[PDB]
Structures are given as C-alpha cells and as structure tokens.
C-alpha cells in the first residue's frame, strides 16, 4: 500500500522559515492534511486538503500541494512552533487513512547548563540488602543529554536507568538516572560518579561510601 | 463548538479487555465518523479504527483486526471501542477524532486522549527512602526515593502540602523489571535542619498506600 515520507526532523532559528516535505505516489491527484501535535498534547489539524487553514491556526503555517509533494512551510518560526507534524492521506482505492512518520521541528533559544544533584543509598535501603544511587538534573536547556556513570574511574552501564528529558514550568529540561548496586558494591568502591553531558560539556558529581 | 470526551483508559494484563468511550457534543452526531488514532511511548502516531456516520462500514488496522470491535450509540453521542486480548505493544495514548466528510477525509477535532498500559507488571506500592541532607551555599538537599511501584500514579507533596517553595518532584522512570521509581528533592536553608522537620507524603492510589517518610 501507500507510504508517506517525511524527514525524521527539522531544525529552524526563529524568524526563519521551515520547510517540511511530504513524498508519495501521485500525490498530483490526491489531497495531503497535515497536524500538529506539540509534547504532552492531542494532535490538531493545521492544513487541510493541501492547502486548507483550519480555524484557529496561524497564518504563518500554509500547506501547498504541488509538482507532486506536499509542503508544510512555517513562515516566522516562533518557539511555540517547537512540534511533531504529520502528513496525511486516503487514496480512494485505500479503506483506512495513512499517516507520515512525523517531522520533528526543534526551534534553534537561551541555552543552560544542567544543575546535578547526586545522593548516596541510604542507610535504610543498605540495609534492606539493596543499594540505589539517585542523580537529579535539573535547569538545562536545549532538552538532550547524556547520562554516564562511573564507579572509581570505570563506566558503567549495567543497573542504570535514566529518564527521557522532559519540560520544567520555566521551559527548561530536567531528567534523573538511578544506578542499582549490590550494598557490596557500594562498599568495595572509592567512590561513585554521575556525569552529565550537555551540549559538549560535563557536570559530575561524585559519592563515597 | 465541537467537544470530545474519552473515558474507560486504564492499567491491564495481557489478554484482558478494555473499552474506552468517546462522548461528542457541539454537533449532530450521525452526521459524522469516528477514528481511532493511538501513540504508542515515544513514537509516532498509528491509525486504529473507524466507524461510518451511519455505522454501516467499520474499518481496522491490520495490527489490531480481529481484536478490536467498534460501536456506536446515537442516543448517548457516544463511541465505543471494545479491545479483547489486549498485548503490551497496544500501550499507547488512544485518541478520539471527529472526521470532517463521509470517509476519505481527514480528522478535524480530535479528543484529549485514554492512557492504555497492558503489562504483565502487577500492583506494587513503593518502597520509600529518605535521601538524607549531607555535605551547596548555605542551602541543603534533601530528599525521598520512592522505589519500585507499579502502575502510576504516585503524588508527593512534603509536609502535608505546607512546604512548596524549592520542591521538584522529577517524572518517574519504567525499569527493566517492569516498575516505576520517582524521586522528590526539596532545597531549604542549611540553617533548618536542626530546628524543622522534613517529611515527605507519598501517595499510590492504586495499591491504597500512602507513605509519610521523615527525612533526617
């Protein structure tokens, strides 16, 4: 059956504009929608029957339809534009619609180190046999990083678990990772490292037992 | 104005059933089709289901035929979806949409979603640790752990709602075994740790716990 393709993402400094592409067969003869679905929210449709604008949605955004792709162009990228968009078709022939993969447009915004907070297992978990250590991050901006753990100077992997990065009430980012140890582990150590990569640089904490 | 409301999301093991609903208002219902479109964690959006305004055509993904079945009830303005044998990859955000024509169309109000999580976890209330205040300027964090528990939610608030100011209570993670762990840190001034008492309130509605945890 039919596939839609549209690049994977997107990134655009705001005032510019953003250009998201949507490929398929004889898209000539077909109409393309297009919707928006912005981090925790439902989807809304933002063009409709290629070049449609719904009520409610910004004149910046304009679907074309033309030379055989579908163009979602956003004109004046504000931060708020910062979404997952979906092209959408249904061939006559098809009985069920058939959605892109979705383009993620990142909009290019004051960036921030992460703060790090990194606390040891507990007493009462140490002596429930189990040994957690908790690394909050905290006030970081745009929303990527990475996560290691060192135990001495040696990585690792095995028994951490880290969050997705997700948006604070002040729009920056924050996320945790948990490192599970033995309570033999914990003690045989000299001591234990979260470090937090963010754009190139480094923010570590270190524990000791 | 048009209006959906879903309802019947919900926790399940594989193989049960569960069925949401799809209440609409703002329009003449049997003038109108009704998708289901889900999101499973992380991805993209799937296409599930439709039923014809009329109710004479029902439609389904390959992923879900033979599964799923769909209603509708005019005299309520209400959808029904019936999920049997449910699978953990059909976890996902289920969304309601209004479509705007009699099929070929495209979805032009959609609802605000179902939560749908089928795992073979079972209910679990947490473990609650404290995470003591140790040794940044004159202010100390401080915090608890709250441990393997399952399903969400869990809600904290530290003593008993009276302190707001300086918490962060982070999204929980989903473990390899299945569980979930969160933690909640609040910053207050070094100066209190002798004189103030810091308890944090755990709630897990699902498993009936609540937990009250001194912190130091």
């Known amino acids: 059956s039919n596939v839609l393709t549209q690049p994977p993402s997107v990134s655009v400094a705001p005032g510019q504009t953003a250009r998201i592409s949507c490929g398929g067969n004889?898209?000539?003869?077909?109409?393309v929608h297009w919707y928006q679905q912005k981090p925790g929210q439902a989807p809304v449709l933002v063009v409709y029957?290629?070049?449609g604008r719904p009520s409610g949605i910004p004149e910046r955004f304009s679907g074309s339809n033309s030379g055989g792709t579908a163009t979602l162009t956003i004109s004046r990228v504000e931060a708020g534009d910062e979404a997952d968009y979906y092209c959408?078709?249904?061939?006559?022939?098809?009985?069920?619609?058939?959605f892109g993969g979705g383009t993620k447009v990142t909009v290019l915004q004051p960036k921030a180190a992460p703060s790090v907070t990194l606390f040891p297992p507990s007493s009462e978990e140490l002596q429930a046999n189990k040994a957690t250590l908790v690394c909050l991050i905290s006030d970081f901006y745009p929303g990527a990083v990475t996560v290691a753990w060192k135990a001495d100077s040696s990585p690792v992997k095995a028994g951490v678990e880290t969050t997705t990065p997700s948006k604070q009430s002040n729009n920056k980012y924050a996320a945790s990772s948990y490192l599970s140890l033995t309570p033999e582990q914990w003690k045989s150590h000299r001591s234990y490292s979260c470090q937090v990569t963010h754009e190139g640089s480094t923010v570590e904490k270190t524990v000791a037992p | 104005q048009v209006h959906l409301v879903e309802s019947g999301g919900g926790v399940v093991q594989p193989g049960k059933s569960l069925r949401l609903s799809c209440a609409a208002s703002?329009?003449?219902?049997?003038?109108?089709?009704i998708h289901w479109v889900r999101q499973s964690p992380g991805k993209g959006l799937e296409w599930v289901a439709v039923?014809?305004?009329?109710?004479?055509?029902?439609y389904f993904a390959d992923s879900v035929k033979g599964r799923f079945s769909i209603s509708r009830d005019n005299s309520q303005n209400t959808v029904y979806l019936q999920m049997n044998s449910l699978r953990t990859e059909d976890t996902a955000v289920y969304y309601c949409?209004?479509?705007?024509?009699?099929?070929?169309?495209?979805?032009?109000?959609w609802g605000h979603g179902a939560l749908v999580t089928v795992s073979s976890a079972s209910t679990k209330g947490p473990s609650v640790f404290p995470l003591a205040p140790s040794s940044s300027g004159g202010t100390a964090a401080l915090g608890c752990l709250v441990k393997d528990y399952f399903p969400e939610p869990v809600t904290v608030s530290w003593n008993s709602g009276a302190l707001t100011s300086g918490v962060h209570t982070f999204p929980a993670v989903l473990q390899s075994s299945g569980l979930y762990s969160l933690s909640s840190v609040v910053t207050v001034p070094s100066s209190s740790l002798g004189t103030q008492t810091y308890i944090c309130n755990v709630n897990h509605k699902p498993s009936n716990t609540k937990v009250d945890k001194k912190v130091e």
């Open positions: 949409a209004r479509e705007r024509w009699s099929g070929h169309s495209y979805l032009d109000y």
């Open positions: 703002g329009f003449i219902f049997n003038h109108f089709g």
């Open positions: 039923i014809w305004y009329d109710g004479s055509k029902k």
């Open positions: 004889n898209l000539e003869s077909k109409y």
């Open positions: 029957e290629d070049s």
């Open positions: 959408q078709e249904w061939d006559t022939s098809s009985d069920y619609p058939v």
